[model samples]
Target chain A: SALPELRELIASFVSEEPPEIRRIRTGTVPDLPGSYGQYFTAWDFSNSIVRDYAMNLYQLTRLATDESVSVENLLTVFRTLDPIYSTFLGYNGFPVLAEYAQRVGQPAESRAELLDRLTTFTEYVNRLTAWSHHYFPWDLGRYRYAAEEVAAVDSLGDPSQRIPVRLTWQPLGVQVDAEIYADLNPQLATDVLKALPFTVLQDHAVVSGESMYAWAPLVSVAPTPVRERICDAPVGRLRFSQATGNKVIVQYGPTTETLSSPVLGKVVDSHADRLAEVGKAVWESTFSSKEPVWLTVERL
Target chain B: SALPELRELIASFVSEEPPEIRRIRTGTVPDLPGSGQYFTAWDFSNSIVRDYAMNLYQLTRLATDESVSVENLLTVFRTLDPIYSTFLGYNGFPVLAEYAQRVGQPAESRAELLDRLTTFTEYVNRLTAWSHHYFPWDLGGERYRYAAEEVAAQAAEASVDSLGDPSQRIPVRLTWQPLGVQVDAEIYADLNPQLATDVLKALPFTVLQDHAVVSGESMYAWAPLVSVAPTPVRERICDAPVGRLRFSQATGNKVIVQYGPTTETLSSPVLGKVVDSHADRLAEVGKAVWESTFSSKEPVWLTVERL
Candidate 1:
């Protein structure tokens, strides 16, 4: 029902589950869920989609390069690229900036000629509050866009604020339906999870691919209640702490999410189900657990 | 090619031919020559034909009437006639004056009116310019049209006056072999010799049907011809001694023309031979005919009836 309420419930179970409770939690890279992702080409895996989103947010600023650009022009560009980019990336493949170069590109350039361009681009990144992680065929990894934040808008007359345009990913299982409600609706939960994930970045879980391995949460920010449960998942049931508003509290059921699919390994599937289960738990946990939570059914 | 000259040619022949040469010639109602015994019907015949012409002319005029005296409204003033005659007249043959009276009556009455209207009204005759004849209907009788005379004036106004059309009288060769070169030309003369005394009359059209055959749109009075035809039974007196074509039953193969005694006819052996065998004296007389009789009030007599 509420983004934070959704995030809090999901964060307690999902962010802390070693993997998640139902094998549904995905989006487990070490840096940040919103920070970056890409598919085949490191260029795409690292950059385009998130940079585009950041640039989108930056456009609200009157002075920035992509500022106040017509929304129609932006939609035209996206719809044009939507089918191609979305297809090539398979929807799950996020193209985002890597964190290392979010602030790393400016000084790394060869000469001052490129210097102006670098400062401008990085400043644009800051101005737009964006991160990128693109890796074209080259090894010059410290590219102009690596990690980016969403854009901030400072209108001429109104208070400047970050315009939050969200993005989401639908896992293969969620898309294929074996795991969507198998865990939960990714489209609905991505936003729900966005609110509280940052608060509990510490309780970690890892996701690895052919070229990389990354974890989900880091300690200080991962809610304490969620963290103790993750640390306890090596054994049986673990307690959820921060959700109880205590640094350490409620015990979790044995880290029950696992799937032995080859491409997914134990992580992707467990990650998806756990995110879904967390969303469900957050939903269930909010009211008395037995209360028939009024789940919204889409009445097309 | 030129009509003034051709007109002279026609005028000469027409003038020479109108004499009473057939007056001395002898024959009976069965075996006589020109203008047979019953001259009155000949005169009446002219009137009848003229009346039919006038009807056509009037109908044309009414169709194009600019005002509304509205003549053909057709009624016998509620004539209480047998139903056969009461319900119909000219244009509206079925819905006559009586049918108009019947519409307000009952359905059975309307049906009865319709039945009586159609019953007893079937036959129509030919020989009518009131329009029974099909176009170009060939007639065996000797009836003159005045068509040529009517057309010459039309030609002048049409500026096609150069195209020559002369009023010629060739002996009636029921054998009009327009095609075969050897076919007899005077066949009608040989076949119908006893009726040789009769002549079909011709005059400028005082009327076409019921209408006055006018020269121009507003032409009321005729210039050189007989009197104008009146509204009903349109007629005019005949004698306009203009020019004539005396078609003698002579050889019957060719007409013998005498332009006031300058007589001639082609004796060509071949049928379709074009020879300037026309008598020069006759051509001049023909012109006089046009100047007087045709485009004007001058007359020519073709002995239609008796002495």
Candidate 2:
């Protein structure tokens, strides 16, 4: 769907009787309906790739617009966006950016470019999902699958564009009856998220001591969107107004996105700190006179 | 010697009329006085290492310094004394372009050049170590002599010049080591006798096979300046030679150098072009030099098997 069409489609899916407002008012999470198996069946195919693309948009827009300057501010905004991210993660993170662009009346070329990229990525993900289902037959067995096997698979149009991971896909959460549909491979998910353009800025989300807040986003960007919808508890939701420069729109929905654990908050905090150190190191290594001699990676 | 000091020392050596340059100038190589065997000893001792050491110093200074423009670098490069025939190979176009594009940019370019400076030294060190180790002779007190010790001692002294001149002098230590070996030597000293030989053994890059000698690229034909990699391989392309130095192993013609006497390896068509044409004399000189330096003519018969 085009940006506006996608936005309206999501708006139509959101029903009001369960009381997203009430869940925001009360911190206690209202248990969601739907059997675990039922949710998993649909969730497995639930266009999470679109959601992944949305998170990439969310981070990239903020970075490119100078909304996120330092690693601290960038990560803070990343955490700050979780209010919306909480809802968007499970249901429709893609639409908010889409709607927000339409609402803000962004440059037409930028909007078109963003949508074009998003749509291409969406199609690619769908093809990969189909390929996985047919080839792996996870229903029969979810053994360690070498990701390299997929490199030559014809549907994955451009090998260069794909993030190459020299890793085996081990199924996690295979036997769990939890509402979560997807077995979240945290590393693969993170790498996929990092594969997005300008994700070199992902380094800005540094991990500090014992904090899971920032690290959570690094890994969770891909998984949380698919895993938490009809089964998990609600995390707080956040929104931003086009008019307000620094204001955050936050809400906690009981029956919505369950991505907001205290663990995630700690991740955000730690990664924020870590990014600064790493950023500083990159800067020092390249520019600072402190080290005059930088050695090359040794050749055999 | 400081960079300037190193520069002058090489200039002095270059001022002398060496037979190699005289041959290049006159077109006919003068048959010199000493017996080919004895003079080969002097040829081994000849001041190529010092000249190679200085070229390294010169290149590193120019390559490392961000302020020096390419024109100035070009001028300096012209002034540099060519010590080895391999120097005739590469005119350093790639290196020059890398520096030219770097000026007035973000720190990345300067950072890159500074990085290249260290690697340039590393190659220089490797080349010097190989020269000293294989040849094992140096000019001493107006007479030529043989001893691996001379090559080792002079290489050590030249290293001091390498380290002294520019602030960033990356010492040549054989970068390669098997997982089991420790005592990783950092400078020229620890590199010479024990480690260089072992590293070369572990890595079997012979002439024109898995190793090339293109004049303007590999510069490998001179045999005096091939790097003895020091430091472990960190990533892929590990042990791969720089520029055109890496000759194809599967090119169907392979030359094998062994310690014993006998020539048996098959010579392919490519070997004919390389060993027979481009470097025909090297094949002839190579056997004599190896036999003279490595094993005394008695039991140590050096052999080249063309496979």
Candidate 3:
């Protein structure tokens, strides 16, 4: 079992609230609306606190792994962890982090249990850092992510489900297969699946150096208009616009423009090269002759 | 006495209705709401018709002066008058234009009456052309001039009686002391009466004149000490023409004088029009005032009197 002193410190660190959490509790900073707001506010406030805790955990992990450090010196460095972790308790006010703390703070029976707890804590911290890097304050305002979007980000730890699709351009003898990640924007993904088997006419294609676009007026199958979700559309992503008319667009290059529609999904890695060839063919054919050039999408 | 043929042509031309008027009568083009709408729609429809008539009248006056054309040929082209004049009749459907037409169409027994009638028709045509060029389709949408504004415009031909008694019209003079030029302006008590009353209570005020930072058209000076209740904006600074004076509510009640085109988005109550009769001195004064902000920080003193 771990030393009683170490266990006591861990318990106290997990229980104490940081200054930011104290501000919210005392009505100095009014709470924002919705669960996502609560999560974001806590994360925003305790981001620095968590960074310090992460560094301390990394140092502790290194010392424990190394036999060079004496027990007294390790304990002295480990003592600094509780105060920083107390600040981290502000972030733990969010249920997701609260559960993470609860799991990591469980009393360790042996050296193996203590090391495992440290490893899990480090994993959670890494996941948080990754999520923060992916989103920004401007992105939060643009997307206005609600409970479902928050849930999708939370479930990023698990494998995302992909929908299989096929792109066919018969005249060019092109057939590329792809899969779309369904978790990024669930509603948009559902709309794309519903809009399958629609042909993108030659008039709807707009080709630029960055990407090739193929779109068609959305069929009745995808009835509802989806709000804008994605800020940037990288290569191999499917997007749509409903500004002038409801149309689905497939992008085939690293397009940096902010598309009006949310991204439906990305082209799977295996077929991306073939998709690029097909995109090149479409671009070439569109300018060369008045001969009709079109692409069709269908569920495989 | 005026020639019978000339009098006949003038009377017939003024009496005939234009195609646009015919459209309005046939209910093809629906009339918009308010007296302003009626006035605008009539002006828009008859603008081209009036333009042609103006050119024809100018040609006739030139021919009459030069003694160039025979009576036969002059009467033939003058006969084209009724058809084009029929188009001018569409604009006359508005009450303002109807009264103008009524006054101009009065039978002339002498050469003076005939010449005066022709001159008045040319004057009305010139006025219509000027008004059309001043406002665009977008400006109409932005300002959305109502009955009061329409009446104010109609009252422009004469001293507007509704602008309150001449005694109540406060005569104000803005003296740019550095430039040594004084521009006369008036405060119409009837237009935004409450604002006029409040501003009158705080007279003989002075403000540091400076060029507007956001807009290129105007010179503005802040008046923080004078407090007036916020009034609904009647005109946007962008839509205001030159010689127009406005008091902005959004910018702590600053007095703005538009000397050129502006793109300012703030709305304000139009106080009065500046008198620019003194050799375009307002423009010169405005430029000096704007330049002074970067160098001298000149002060403009305004004094008011009940006249």
Candidate 4:
């Protein structure tokens, strides 16, 4: 009832065939006494979604420690979400949200890892928002909500997994799917999208397979041009590459970067064919080297 | 056997029955959520000092809640006073030496006495566990260090002897010259002193025999003694004063504490006794500001008060 349930829960994420998510969540990551060192898996995981909660929390705490994000800056982000500043159940409150924004914003060392972490973070947020929606039902107020769905493709590349890793909808109860284009690497795509401003949000993108896939202007203005490497994106992720000069290219599953265009964006696999009918206005518009054009994803 | 036994243990501490340790631990307060809001009462009572542990967790959570603080956190504090002191084995707190003392004293109930000692340790343990669960920093264990930097000189100034061990040393005569103010205070040996003086006296630090002593002092100058320490430390100390306390988020701490005569009854329960002495005046100011701001559930502006 106790240790077995807890072990299985953690093993689903990281394996303790040699200490993984279980130890990581318990704050024994770098040092045995690293962060939340006092409690064990028993104490933290006593509630639902403890592993996901812990992963988000651990990374945020680590980021805060490294001064990559200041507490004040987090408070700014927190104010935007929970304006009235009500404490969420338990210690899972504004502080945790602040930690999340700080963590998600930080750049990872490699493109692939960044892509995976961003998707993992997305999954975590989906679980949390969904739980919040279920419990708080009355109002979500810009806070994302989660709804559980089984992954059809399984491992994306047997990926037989549950617990709803997909964040397919917005908190406004709108079903806005995304796509991941393997431009540069899956990580950089998610990173760039996360970093971009959410000026306009739509219901769906052009779901066409080869046509323009889920593209939108990232911000009100364009960004400076730069060169970046390209990599094949995993499922639920799209990597956008940057070159000093090229029109954005669309590709099939897990495609690598092409030397032709300087900048390229990826969309999630789900919206490959579906993205064609939607996001037509934004995709065909004149996008400059300075402008950030983002491609959204929807998992099939 | 295992689960039922654990549930029974929890029920023992968090029951509705009267005259039990659980109710006492809940502090007989109004509308404060009981000890098991997050976990089951069963999970919380797994330790010897479970009551104190629960009480601390409940209060911390309550403090974080805006409505709860506005409704009635003070009453809980009043009830918690005796419980906190008893656990610490002194009128004050974290009485490590007294915690190690004999458990078979007067009333002569060894069990009750040991309960007191255990509660203190448990309280520390809970604080550490919860703090780490939230942040990478140590929230409760060590005494706050004095601010290392110096500030501008002012109208009137005074200093106290710098004191403590290597990890906890404070400078002699840490002063706070208010931007604009004139106030006088009397000095009496041990009338009102720094909260960390016990550690100071027990540890090794220089005592300047050469510095001249002044007959009178200003609160403005002495304010730094309380202000320079970390917010948690300042908060624990300001619980004993009259001044303003607001949270600050710079320099690895989360609060700035001020003690002045302006709100002499700030920390005082009794308005009459609030101005009893110079220290009392400082406490009063603290009490006044805290209640006002605490009632509002908002951080007051002194431009963030980072220093």
Candidate 5:
């Protein structure tokens, strides 16, 4: 009797595979025409990042290795997300973020492959952010939570038996009905509206004369004029700041600027559309605040 | 029989890995969130950083060229750093860091050990800095030089961008003049005299500061105000006003190492003797340098004493 019930329990309910995100946390990139070689006679990922991290990306891409094709392509990719990580984590803490590393026997060659290493790591880190991204527990047989629907990889682009690679906490209660959570995330709805905003956060002075919460003051595709103190932006009439504490400044001339924390200047950059639509889900799921996060300081 | 053997083997292997705890969720978290694995590195539990991810020097900044010697492999280990040495083993870098976790020898932050050759193309060099950057890096196995070049460095969050081929010989040099102070080099020899070599663990170039020293003398230096700060007990030794360390970034570049009494612990070569007539202060200073980075192609060393 007990065995059949346990078997049923295991079968009827499915849990999302724990998402493992692997990113190239730290290492060297080229600096001069061929300076990376100075520290590493043999190809190594860690040393390159160190050289790159210390010299900054400029030395890595333009002048690291004599091989232009390799450096340029690699630099372009590394540079794309490179600035994001630097800005997100800030200085000194750079080394801390990539704290988990072990020497992979294989050597690196071109930049694309190298960049994939970081991509792998990015996916790896997200998984560990929470036992479950949404802080909820499983019910007797099943558990469900709300989630912003992410594009199934197959549907996103070139479709060919695409597998949705697991990156973070997975198999939550369910995406659609998460709000009815018995133990729900306080910041869940807030994070959804405050989807990652934008990387280039400019001036928020657009609504200076207007309402303080006017979003997207001036919208423009053109480059910011030199004479202007800040980029022009447009303001949205509605204010989502109540549910989500974020205040994206809408400029009149330029465009919408994601607001930042007055103290830390941290901009919730995930866009306004369904957050899952954007990939920067530190955790696609929510962390249960019902539990004492401090005790779980181990994970923190 | 076969099942038992497999289970035992699996259990043994799992035992060797870092310890994992069962996280029974209660209080704020009522739903039992289940158990998970955590990495034990650099710091005990401050951050999720793993051991290999941090640099030993960043954990401990107490070692100085003035106090001990910054010229030898022990210079890397002076702060008793375990991860860097393991990564630098003959195999290049450590493929399995869980082994390091098992032994209980990893990196932790100390003000003195910061700013050295933590960044290099050498796998160990980067590993040395990982723990320094983050006291505890939790991601397992993925933090090291898995892929050479741009990706690895970026993942590691290193300051520069010099990722490239694995088997490319290059030149890298580090230079800085440590402030002058003296230590009983004889004591250094007494503690670990086996690591001494009289020649300058000399870096390729020594940027002369406001002061200079004659040949065959030793000195002690510490991080800027650390040594000079009013101390209640231990005599604070000041090696230099500012102990600076820099590395060269050019492949095929030559490195020069020079040791001075100001930057080295002056010691006389006398084995098996605690005190020798000619023993100088800071015994292993020059010797440590020679033993660590005086030969082959590139010359790179970390001066712990100077800022």
Candidate 6:
């Protein structure tokens, strides 16, 4: 049977005991840190398995390329290996074997075309393998930075440490008390607090279902260094826009949609209902006369 | 006022006679091919505008490095860009404005400058990360460029030679035993060369055909434990028209024959189309196969052929 011959060819290229598995068996894997470290270790294991599987397929393709191998023998070998390869490798390497089988006893032109395709496929796999090796280390650095950011934000959970602030719309008869996490974005938070008592002009306030975004274009708040904040704005949370204008946004609904901006703080539980009422008023006013809603902010 | 000064600075950095606008005005824009050409052209124009705006912000940073700017005026000028410029202008100006405010009033202490610089470097790094993620095709080195060129070439070729040469089409047949239905089909090698060629090789094979749950209303599907690498997906099953046949390599090596309506999100390369005359009979077979499950019988035998 072609299965015995196929196994012989595969064993020549692939070791019975791969180095990565051996390392794991010996308990010699490198010590990695954090959740990301654990993730990378698991990924490395799968990568090793896939690599070995790919190498075995590569050998089969190489054997098929030889002229001495009969077309009947080629068909037998492929038919024998098809189920085994699919079960283990999930069909990523099947097209090569399939094409090789089809080209059997075909015209010279078809056979030549198959050769070009097989070569291209082989080269593509090799390049992808090389790129992954270089890419993973850089990805690990990014993940480590992400983990550190998460830890830093987690430390800022103490309510007493937050800076208190207040939002008032005199015309709408609404006032809401909020707090700012100055440590989360030190420079920007400090500047925004310093530029307090600024009016979010009539045209600047956008009301969308239980949230009111008041854009204070006059208040110059610096962009936070972190693109994505570890602590995001949940319900009743206040957020500052990363864009040019200092946007003071308050959410009062259970919305999954998040802004790609840094969290300033959250509205006090006592004034959460007031913020919701103010948001509804703004939404109603937006459709009625399109009049500007002026929301003023100040340090409490 | 900072408004006029901001306008002047923006005007100096950004030309009133932008080159792209002038090209459009003069009707001197390069001729582009296909739908993709239009998309890439629009992208290029936006890239240029963003680059100009970013350059203006960079100039603000450079000026802040010197001790000659006023803190009060920096805040006012920063507001103008948000109302006027596009994309990067919104996020970029704030940082420069803050740095300008700090340096101008505090008289630029070494420690303070260093802190601002550190913040500035972080902003730049974040922007770089964003650029890499959002515009990978633009920033991803030589290989991406070559791949893009190849894609464009392929698109052009496909447009010119729709369905390719008829000689390349490999004839095949499908027979369902329970429904006494036999349908004619042709494998389009040009559509998915790798998959079509492979399926063509394994001719005259029979599958125990069954019906898909969500997709059963319109198509007959069977899973054969055959190994094949995934070919480039041409369309989703949802988008495939009636009488179309497809083999999905991604999802359990499923071979699907569409008869009526299908809403499966599974993507697969089209193997070929079923013969128009026998399409009705195929649908009849699909219905029987689907309805057979309630009676608890063996799966209907669907045989494939090259004859």
Which is the leading candidate under DockQ?
5
- Which residues of candidate 2, in runs, are more than 4 Å off? A1-300, B1-46, B83-127, B136-307
Prediction RMSDs, each to the true structure: 50.2, 28.8, 31.6, 24.8, 24.8, 30.6
Q: Residue B244 CA error for candidate 1 (Å)?
A: 99
On residues A1-300, what C-alpha lDDT tens digit does candidate 3 reach at each position? Answer: 223333443333322333333443221322221011122323333342343344345435444444444333333333323322432343233334444554445544544565555554553443342222112121121112234422332224224466788877757667677665566556556766776776644222321133444433221112224333333555566665422223445666543223245445556666666666666565444433334456677898
Per-residue CA lDDT of candidate 1, range B36-79, in tens?
12121121122222222222222222222223112111111111
Query: Would candidate 1 be rated incorrect, acceptable, medium or high by CAPRI criteria?
Result: incorrect
Query: Which candidate has the highest TM-score of all?
Result: 3
> What is the two-chain DockQ of model 3?
0.01
Ranked by TM-score, the better of candidates 3 and 4 is 3
Which candidate gets the maximum lDDT versus the true structure?
A: 6
Write candidate 6's Cα lDDT for A163-265 as tens digits: 8887887587787777888777777778777767666432212212245565442223254653333124456777665242245666666432223556677
Over B1-307, each residue of candidate 3 has an lDDT whose tens digit, in order, gives 2344434433333323233344442323332211112322333343333334333333333333322223321332233233234333433333323333343343323344335435444344433322322222221212221233533342353323234455656677776664667778777666777777766665665544555532444776543222334354367655676877787532334567778655433456867767657426677876675455423433344333333
TM-score of chain B of 6: 0.45
Please report how far candidate 4 places residue B56 from its true position, in Å: 28
Off by over 4 Å in 4: A1-179, A182-298, B1-276, B283-307
Model 6 spans > 4 angstroms off: A1-177, A184-236, A239-263, A268-273, A279-300, B1-168, B171-184, B195-271, B274-307
lDDT (Cα, tens digit) per residue for candidate 4, span B1-307: 2123323432332212212223223322111111112121112221213223333333333334444322233333333333233423221123322332322123233334324333433333333222212221121112211122211111122112111123332322211222122123221113123323322232222111000000001011101111111222222222333422222111111122334312111121110011133333344333333322213212111111101
Model 4 lDDT, residue A91, Cα? 27
- Candidate 4 lDDT at B226 equals 12
**Candidate 6 lDDT over residue span B1-307, tens digit each:** 2234333432332112233333322223332210111222222232323332232333233334333233322322343222223222222233334434443344334445434433333233223222211221211122111233533353354321245766787878888886778989877887788788767776766655655433424444333223244466466655677778887543334467877554334456778888678777765776676554322334566788996
| Model 3 chain A weakest 10-residue run by lDDT | A134-143
Off by over 4 Å in 1: A1-74, A81-84, A91-300, B1-307
Which window of 10 residues has the lowest lDDT sum in candidate 6 chain B?
B32-41
Residue B62 displacement in candidate 5 (angstroms): 20
The candidates, ranked best first by lDDT, are 6, 3, 4, 2, 5, 1
Q: Rate the local accuracy (lDDT) of all candidates.
A: 0.21, 0.24, 0.43, 0.26, 0.22, 0.44
